[PDB]
C-alpha cells in the first residue's frame, strides 16, 4: 500500500504530559516571573517574548531592561535551544512514511463482508488445493464468492495482483514468502507481517502402513537437529526483500496545517469575543 502519516506524528517526539507541563505551567511560571522581576512591560508582552524565544525565528520582541530579568531570559533561551535541538534531532525519523495494512487478517470484515464497500474487493485463490478445501469447510459463502475470482496459477495470480485486476491472494505460506522475497521492487507483501492461519507443514506422502515411515521420520529429524534445514532454506527459500530519502507531501504535513487552521479559527473566535467585549 501507499501508506500515510498520522497528523499527530510531529507531536510524538515529546509526550503530551511534557508538552502541557512545559508549555502551560513552566512557561507561565517563567513569564510571570520575568514580569515581577521587571517590576522590582505588560504580562502579555512577557508571554509574547517567552513564546518567541522558545522557537527563535527573529520574532520582534521587547527585551526586559532589568539585569535579573535579562539573566532569566538568558537561562530560558538556553533551555529553549536545548528544546529545539532535542525536537529537531529525531524529527526526520519521527515524520516517516509508515505503511498500514489494509486487511487486519483472515477474519477481517472486508473478507467477511465484501459487498458493503464502494469497490468490490477482488480476492481469490488457485483451485485444486488444500486452501480451497480449508476455505470450503470453514467458510462456504466466502468460497462461493471465491469461485468467480479463481486464478489459473501462482504466476498468473502474481501478474494479476501487480495490476489492478486483483486485491488479495490467499494460498499456502511458503510459496507466498518465497514470492515476496523474490518480488521485484517489493510491491507485494503478506498481511500481518507473516500471519499464518493453517500453520501446517509440508510432509512426505507414503502408502498406508509403509515400512519406510520410520526411517524417513528419523532421517528428517536428524536433518532438522543437525541444522541442515537452515542452509537448505537459506539457499533456496531465501528472499531479497527480507531483512531490508523520501519526499514530504501534504499528508505528511497534515498535522501542522490542521494546527494552523485551528489557530485561524480560534483567532477569528477571539476577534468576535473582543468585539462583543468592547461592545
Amino acid at each position: 500500500s501507499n501508506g500515510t502519516v498520522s497528523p499527530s506524528a510531529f507531536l510524538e517526539p515529546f509526550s503530551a504530559s511534557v508538552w502541557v507541563m512545559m508549555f502551560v505551567m513552566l512557561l507561565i511560571v517563567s513569564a510571570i516571573a520575568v514580569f515581577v522581576f521587571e517590576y522590582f512591560f505588560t504580562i502579555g508582552k512577557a508571554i509574547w517574548l517567552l513564546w518567541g524565544l522558545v522557537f527563535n525565528n527573529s520574532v520582534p520582541v521587547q527585551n526586559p531592561k532589568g539585569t535579573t530579568s535579562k539573566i532569566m531570559v538568558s537561562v530560558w533561551a538556553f533551555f529553549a535551544v536545548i528544546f529545539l535541538a532535542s525536537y529537531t534531532a529525531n524529527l526526520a525519523a519521527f515524520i516517516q512514511e509508515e505503511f498500514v495494512d489494509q486487511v487486519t487478517g483472515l477474519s477481517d470484515k472486508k473478507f467477511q463482508r465484501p459487498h458493503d464497500y464502494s469497490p468490490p474487493f477482488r480476492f481469490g485463490t488457485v483451485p485444486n488445493g488444500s486452501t480451497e478445501r480449508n476455505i470450503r469447510n470453514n467458510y462456504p459463502y466466502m468460497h462461493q464468492y471465491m469461485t468467480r475470482f479463481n486464478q489459473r496459477g501462482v504466476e498468473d495470480a502474481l501478474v494479476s495482483l501487480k495490476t489492478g485486476k486483483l486485491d488479495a491472494f490467499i494460498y499456502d505460506a511458503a510459496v507466498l514468502n518465497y514470492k515476496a522475497g523474490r518480488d521485484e521492487g517489493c510491491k507485494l507483501v503478506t498481511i500481518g507481517s507473516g500471519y499464518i492461519f493453517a500453520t501446517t507443514g509440508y510432509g512426505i506422502a507414503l502408502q498406508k502402513g509403509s515400512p519406510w515411515k520410520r526411517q524417513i521420520d528419523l532421517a528428517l529429524l536428524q536433518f532438522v537437529g543437525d541444522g541442515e534445514m537452515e542452509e537448505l532454506e537459506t539457499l533456496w527459500l531465501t528472499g531479497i526483500c527480507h531483512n531490508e530519502s523520501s519526499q514530504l507531501d501534504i499528508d505528511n504535513m497534515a498535522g501542522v496545517f490542521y494546527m494552523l487552521a485551528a489557530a485561524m479559527a480560534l483567532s477569528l473566535i477571539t476577534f468576535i469575543w473582543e468585539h462583543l467585549f468592547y461592545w
Binding site: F55, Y87, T88, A92, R182, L248, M264, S267, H275
Partner: protein, 131 residues
Amino acid sequence: KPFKYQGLTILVKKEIPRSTLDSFMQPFQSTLWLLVGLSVHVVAVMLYLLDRFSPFLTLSSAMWFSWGVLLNSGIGEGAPRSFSARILGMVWAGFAMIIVASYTANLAAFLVLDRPEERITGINDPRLRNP
C-alpha cells in the same frame, strides 16, 4: 610457489554525484512549495486585516514581519498590536519553525544524491545471484 596472493572480486563504476539545479528544492514537493508560498501571503494579509479593524501594522510591515519570521531574518521590526493578532502571529512563527526544521532535517540528504545501489556485497548479493 606463488609470487602474488590475490582472489576474484568485482569492479563497478562509481556513480559520481550529479547535482541538479533544483536539488535543494527536492526535500519539499513543488505542490508543497506553492501551498506554503500561498500560506505566507494569506497569513501576511490576515495579520494587518485583523490589526487595522481593532478598536483597542500596515501592508508592508505585516508582509515583512511574516517573511522575516518565516526566514528567520528580522527584516521587519513590527509587531502586531491586537491580542488575537499576537496569537495568530506566534502560531505562524511556530509553523515556520516546524517547516524549516523539517526542511533542515532532509536538505543535506537530498543535496547529495548518493545511494548504496551500486555497492556490491560480494557474490551473495541478489542482483548478481538473480540475473
